[PDB]
Scaffold this active site. Structure first.
Site, PDB file in Angstrom:
ATOM      1  N   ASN A  52     -10.457-128.476 115.568  1.00 10.67           N
ATOM      2  CA  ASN A  52     -10.157-129.601 116.365  1.00 10.67           C
ATOM      3  C   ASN A  52      -8.654-130.411 115.865  1.00 10.67           C
ATOM      4  O   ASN A  52      -8.687-130.253 114.767  1.00 10.67           O
ATOM      5  CB  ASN A  52     -11.577-130.253 115.356  1.00 10.67           C
ATOM      6  N   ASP A 119     -12.228-123.046 112.504  1.00 11.78           N
ATOM      7  CA  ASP A 119     -12.574-124.762 112.253  1.00 11.78           C
ATOM      8  C   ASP A 119     -13.687-124.421 113.209  1.00 11.78           C
ATOM      9  O   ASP A 119     -13.922-123.055 113.514  1.00 11.78           O
ATOM     10  CB  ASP A 119     -11.551-125.903 112.562  1.00 11.78           C
ATOM     11  N   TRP A 120     -13.720-125.621 114.512  1.00 11.35           N
ATOM     12  CA  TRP A 120     -14.701-124.969 115.808  1.00 11.35           C
ATOM     13  C   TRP A 120     -14.180-123.886 117.492  1.00 11.35           C
ATOM     14  O   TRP A 120     -14.433-123.459 117.330  1.00 11.35           O
ATOM     15  CB  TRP A 120     -14.592-126.457 116.657  1.00 11.35           C
ATOM     16  N   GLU A 143     -12.148-121.452 107.444  1.00  8.78           N
ATOM     17  CA  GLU A 143     -12.139-122.662 107.685  1.00  8.78           C
ATOM     18  C   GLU A 143     -13.803-123.249 108.909  1.00  8.78           C
ATOM     19  O   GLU A 143     -13.125-123.422 109.663  1.00  8.78           O
ATOM     20  CB  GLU A 143     -11.136-123.362 107.660  1.00  8.78           C
ATOM     21  N   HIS A 284      -7.195-127.070 104.245  1.00 15.85           N
ATOM     22  CA  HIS A 284      -7.681-127.060 105.281  1.00 15.85           C
ATOM     23  C   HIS A 284      -6.976-126.707 106.874  1.00 15.85           C
ATOM     24  O   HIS A 284      -7.439-125.188 107.809  1.00 15.85           O
ATOM     25  CB  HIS A 284      -8.708-127.831 106.725  1.00 15.85           C
TER      26      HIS A 284
END
Ligand SMILES: O=C(Cc1ccc(O)cc1)Nc1ncc(-c2ccc(O)cc2)nc1Cc1ccccc1
Length: 309
Positions: A52, A119-120, A143, A284
């Protein structure tokens, strides 16, 4: 409090337009994908997946370390970066996955691929791996969406934050006020970005409204067993069990120091066998604080995986 520029950064800085000019475009289904492809050494392929708020640009200082050893391919996910938009107007995990797998079919990939996910983007890689268990040479993650979040592991602040993001007030704070790009992204980078670097992240989402939809749809996919999207919760359960049993799949986990509410990520990563653990500076978006350390760790891991094959 204030964050400070890295005083040497303006000298190796890569602007948005400099990065985009090095990318290629390919029609995929009813849209198109913008992507970086280093082309050389195509007997292997390392596919880097952002998450994201970001785009392929996130990897611009990481990828040069790995290009000498393997072909590196870095897409802008649909609706993000300079890619086309989603044909059905939707930006859920499975919508992203539809374009990613269709795009893979056009890339002349080797039988076994190396994934690098954030992340995603890591969720996409994990789900691809679960569905294509014979196509995976190694996975680097960081992450990452490693597992579901059970209700007894869900504290009130995250419950209310997701309630906010799933409400009309959450939709306006993203679509009208660009919360994830203007606030979350710089808040989770330890250095201050150069203005031109921040502008590369802002550019896809500079206008108000629906263009910002992917940055709202991603957090709405969060795999909370209590109240989260049932299809995503099942996807994550499925690939988590597969990863916990994948003894012969070499993995690299890059831990952030100090991270940001990342303890459950690290603990979840520790349940996957055959994982090498390294640590770099960051919150992050650790690519922006330690890209060369990250690139060196990934390069060494890839070389070790290839040598042991
Ligand atoms: O939504 C996510 C994505 C995710 C990552 C890993 C995972 O296993 C499941 C989902 N993360 C997130 N999303 C929101 C918050 C958050 C929100 C508000 C707050 O006060 C504190 C944390 N924290 C986080 C990080 C987190 C928290 C709990 C368990 C795993 C990962």
């Amino acid at each position: 409090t204030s964050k400070v520029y890295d005083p040497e950064q303006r000298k190796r800085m890569i602007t948005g337009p400099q990065w985009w000019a090095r990318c290629k475009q390919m029609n995929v289904l009813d849209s198109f994908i913008n992507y970086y492809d280093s082309e050389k050494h195509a007997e292997n392929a390392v596919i880097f997946l952002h998450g994201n708020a970001t785009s392929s640009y996130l990897w611009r200082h990481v990828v040069p370390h790995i290009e000498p050893v393997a072909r590196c391919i870095i897409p802008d996910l649909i609706g993000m970066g300079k890619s086309g938009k989603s044909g059905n107007g939707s930006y859920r995990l499975l919508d992203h996955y539809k374009y990613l797998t269709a795009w893979f079919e056009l890339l002349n990939l080797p039988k076994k691929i190396i994934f690098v996910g954030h992340d995603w983007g890591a969720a996409l890689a994990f789900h691809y791996a679960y569905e294509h268990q014979d196509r995976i040479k190694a996975i680097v993650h960081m992450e990452s969406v490693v597992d579901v979040i059970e209700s007894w592991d869900e504290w009130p602040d995250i419950e209310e934050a997701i309630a906010l993001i799933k409400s009309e007030e959450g939709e306006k704070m993203v679509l009208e006020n660009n919360f994830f790009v203007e606030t979350v992204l710089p808040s989770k980078i330890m250095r201050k970005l150069e203005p031109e670097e921040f502008a590369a992240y802002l550019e896809p989402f500079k206008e108000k409204g629906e263009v910002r939809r992917p940055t709202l749809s991603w957090p709405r996919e969060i795999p909370l067993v209590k109240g989260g999207k049932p299809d995503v919760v099942q996807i994550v359960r499925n690939y988590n069990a597969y990863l916990r049993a994948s003894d012969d799949l070499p993995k690299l986990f890059i831990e952030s120091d100090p991270g940001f509410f990342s303890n459950a990520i690290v603990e979840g990563a520790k349940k996957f066998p055959n994982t090498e653990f390294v640590k770099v500076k960051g919150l992050h978006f650790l690519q922006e604080d330690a890209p060369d350390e990250m690139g060196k760790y990934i390069k060494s891991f890839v070389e070790r995986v290839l040598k042991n094959e």
